[PDB]
C-alpha cells in the first residue's frame, strides 16, 4: 500500500532535483538557504539522492544521527511501540515514561529527568528551573535573576534564545527581548569570574565545545575551572550537551573530558537517533523539584513512543561502543588531515575538534569557502559549514573503519583540489 | 508476540502494580505534573487499557492530539514505512518529502507558505517572531516597539515568552524577568480589542477561537469575525491558534470556520500528527512569511521527513473519515443529552458548553469537590482531566463510534447523577 505522502508526491510528477527545489520556493517558508541535494534514503553513514547517487553524510543532523540513518534496532523499537501506545499526556500514567526516566537517571547519574521535545525547549526549561531555584532557594530579589552565557552560543530559536544570542541574524528584528542575560567571551575564565561577582546570577549556561559557533574547543581545564568558580558562588552550571553529548566527542558526555558532572544537563538530538524529537533536562532533586505541578508542561514531552525510541537509541550507543569508536576514528581523522593539509594548503586556518566533532576553518579572504563545500560534494561528501568559513565533519559514529578511511581520503582530495585550482 | 526491548527492560524492574509504576514515576520523573490515576499500557481508537486490562474511554485524547484515535492503522503504517527509509536530513539538505508535505498543507488550508516546527509552543514562538519582524520591516514601526495583543487566560505553551504573556499565576510565577511587548485584554470582548488596536505599534492579535486550557471558553457568535475586521482596519495581523480547536474538533476543519475567518497566520499542532510524533505548523501569506529569510529561524527536527509523512496521513484520515461531520453530530447530541439530564437535577453544574467534540461541564467547586466527579467518571470507565480544577473536560477521539459515544454519554451522565446522590 502506498501511503498518502507517496501517492500525493507521485501525483506532483516531480522528476528532477530542480522540480523539488521549485516546490520548496513555492510552498516551504524560506528560512533556510538553498540546498544542493535531494536525499531520498539513508542507511548508517550513507545517503542516496533521488537519482540514486551515494554520499557520506558528514552533517548527521549536526550530531542527531550518531547511530546512523535508520538504525534497525531503533526503527524496530519505534514500530513496536507505535502499534501499542504513542501518547497519554503526563496527565495520565503509562508503562513507559517512568521506566525510561529511570534508565536515563541511572545512565547519567541524576535524580530527576524532565523530558521535552526539542533542544530549544530543553534550554527554556533549564532556564526556568534555574530562575525559579534562584528565587526560592537562593532568595534573590524578585525578577532579578541573571544567567551568564557566552558570545556565539547557540541553544535554539525561541524569542528567549534570540534574546541571549550574539548572532545578528538570530536576533535582528525579533525584539523586544527577554532581559536577564550577561554575555561573556567563551573560553575565558577571567571574564566568567568577573561576571560571577553579581549575587543575582542563577546559572552559567555553556557548551563544552561551541557547536554552531564553529566547533570551538576551549583550552584544557576550562569547564573544570568554570564549575569551581560557579560553585564558589552557589551558581548552577548548566551544560548544554545537545550537540556534544552522547559519545560524539569520544566520551559519554563532553563534560567528562574535564570530569565535570553538570548541575543541570541538557540532552537532545541523538537521544532519539534522529527518529523523533525528544530532549532531556536532568538535575539533582533539590533543583529539579522546584518545578511543582502546574508550573511547567508540554503536550508531547515524555510521550511513550519517544521514550521507547530514546531507550533503544541510548542502548545502541553503549552496545556498539560508539564513544570508543568516535575517539579512535576522530584522532585518526585529525592526524590525517593535519599531516596532509597543513603547509600544503595555506588557507586552512585550523583543523580542530574532539572525537568525531571536527572542523576545518578556512580563511574566507583567501578562498571562497563554498568552493570547498561543492568539491566535497563532487567527491561524495555532504557537509554544511557554519559561519560560512567553518567546514564541519560530523559523520554518524557507526561509520565503519573502511567507510571512514574512504571518506577521509575523499575529504583530503577535496581540499587539495581546491588548492590546486587556486 | 515476542517481548519488545522496553517490555523486557521494565520486566527487569519487576514493576507490576499501578503503585510500582506510580513509585517509579515519583522517583525518577521531574515532578511537574499532578499524581495520576491510572497506568495506561495500550490504546486503540477511542479506548485505552490499563496494565490490568481494564478498559476506559479516553475523554482527554491528548487535549485533542488524538482525534484520529489511538494507534490509527493508517498513520502507524505511514510512520513505519517512512521510518525504514529516511527520518531526518535537516533543512540544510533537501529531501523528497518536506516540500510535498508543505504543498499538501498549503493547498488544504489555503496558504502560500508553510513553516513546520515540532511543538505548539514553537509554532507560537515562530508566529510571534514573524509578526514582529513583519511589523518592523513592512509596517515600519519604531525598533523594539512591536506589541502583540493576547487574551486573559490564554494558553500557548511553556516557553519563557509564553509565560511572559500568561495571566495564569503558576504559569509565570518566579520565571521572570519577562519578555516585554504584550498587551492582555479580556477574551470575548470586542470593545477591549478595539481600544487596544488604537496603538499603532501593535503587530498582531493572537487568539484562540475557543479558549482551551482556559476552560473551553466559547465566545459569543461573531467574535472572531468582528475581531478580524477590527484588525484589518489597523493593518494588524490576526494570528489564530488552532492547535487545540483545529482539525475537525469543533465540527469544522478549523474552528475559525464557524466565523468564516481565514486567519492571517494559522497555527496547527496536536492532531496534525494524530498524536504520533510532535509536529506543528505556522502558515501565512507570502508577503508575511517571507520576512523569515535564510538563517533567521531554524529547528533541528522541524520539517523532518518522518513527521511530514505522518502528518499527511493524519490529515487525510480527517478527511476520509468525515470527522468534522462526526464531531458536529455527536457533539450536538452530547450537549443536548447532558443539558437535558443534568441541568436542574444537579445544582452544582454551572454550565455545559462547547462546540463539536470540544465540550466542558464547569462545576461549582464551592458546592461540590470537583475531584469526586473525576473519580466517579473513572469508576464508570471514563478518563477525563479537568482544567482550572472545576472545568470538567470531555474531549474524546473524533473516531468514537455512535455506539461508543452513546455508551460513554450514558456513563458520564450516570457519574454526575451519582455524585449528586452522594451529596444528598
Ligand atoms: C548546542 C545546542 N543546543 C540547542 C540546540 C537547539 O536544538 P533544537 O534545534 O532541537 O531546538 C542546538 C541545535 O543545533 C544545539 O546545537
Ligand atoms: C491552544 C494551544 N496552543 C498551544 C499549545 C502548546 O502546545 P505544546 O504543548 O505542543 O507546546 C497548547 C497545548 O495544549 C494549546 O492548547
Author numbering:
A (entry chain A): 18 to 439
B (entry chain B): 17 to 440
Provide the publication's sentences verbatim.
Toxoplasma gondii is one of the most significant parasites that impacts human health, with estimates that as many as one third to one half of the human population are infected. At the Center for Structural Genomics of Infectious Diseases (CSGID), the first Toxoplasma Structural Genomics Pipeline was established. The enzymes selected from the TDR database as small and tractable for expression and crystallization included: phosphoglycerate mutase II (hereafter referred to as PGM), nucleotide diphosphate kinase (NDK), ribulose phosphate 3-epimerase (RPE), ribose-5-phosphate isomerase (RPI), and ornithine aminotransferase (OAT). The genes encoding these enzymes were cloned, proteins expressed and purified, crystallized, and crystal structures were determined.
Ornithine aminotransferase, the final enzyme considered herein, is an enzyme involved in the urea cycle, TCA cycle, polyamine synthesis, and other pathways. It catalyzes a reversible reaction allowing interconversion of intermediates from ornithine to amino acids. Each monomer has a mixed α/β structural fold and consists of the cofactor PLP-binding domain (residues 87–336), an N-terminal domain (residues 17–86), and a C-terminal domain (residues 337–441). The dimerization interface is primarily formed between residues of the PLP-binding and N-terminal domains of TgOAT. The cofactor-binding domain of TgOAT non-covalently binds PLP molecule, i.e., PLP does not form the Schiff base with conserve Lys286. Similarly to homologous OAT structures obtained in complex with the cofactor, PLP interacts with Thr135, Gly136, Ala137, Tyr171, Trp172, Glu224, Asp257, Ile259, Gln260, Lys286, Ser315, and Thr316. Most of these residues are highly conserved among TgOAT homologs and represent a viable, “druggable” pocket (SiteMap score 1.03). One 1,3,5-Tris(4-carboxyphenyl)benzene (BTB), polyethylene glycol (PEG) and acetate (ACT) molecule were modeled to interpret additional electron density in chain B. TgOAT appeared dispensable (fitness score of +1.2) in the tachyzoite CRISPR/Cas9 assays consistent with TgOAT appeared to be expressed predominantly in the oocyst stage (ToxoDB).
